[PDB]
Amino acid sequence: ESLVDNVLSALGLDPIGTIVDKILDLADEFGDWLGATEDTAANLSNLLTKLLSDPASVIGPLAQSMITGLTGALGNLNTAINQIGDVLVGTVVTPIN
Amino acid sequence: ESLVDNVLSALGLDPIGTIVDKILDLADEFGDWLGATEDTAANLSNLLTKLLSDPASVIGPLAQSMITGLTGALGNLNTAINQIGDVLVGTVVTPIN
Secondary structure (H helix, E strand, O other), X not given: OHHHHHHHHHHOOOOOOOHXXXXXXXXXXXXXXXXXXXXXXXXXXXXXXXXXXXOOOOOOOOOHHHXXXXXXXXXXXXXXXXXXXXXXXXXXXOOOO | OHHHHHHHHHHOOOOOOOHHHHHHHHHHHHHHHHHHHHHHHHHHHHHHHHHHHOHHHHOOOEOHHHXXXXXXXXXXXXXXXXXXXXXXXXXXXXXXX
């Protein structure tokens, strides 16, 4: 009975009742344990597979600055366009390339 | 005694002492098991929520080539700018668009 009670206390449930009732509660607790473990494993596998195949739904919107060199390339292109516009009216500027 | 011994051996600890001490060690092992399971579940849930809401912190820097068509679009724009620059001085080239 002490083994049963200590195991039940460790798993969370408070042991009150007969040995049979405590054992039944212990069995239900291990059933919930099985459910939790299998659900965690399945969720991890599903998340891995979805993140590999289709990362749209799982991953939310992200800032352009996170991409390496994206902001640099966009700035270079915009500055090139601005310089192209400016040279035609004057305002001598250092060419980009 | 053999049930306690086999369970403790399966869960990892080496059972040395009385049956009461082995039972206490078994209870502590199940407590650590519970901690591990709950922490794994919480970490998975937190990672899922963070990846859905704000993916900047969790996800590290990534190469532009991973994005579909980003390198193609950047190359097309750069080649268009280069052709615009080149035509004004000569060197007849195939137009892009």
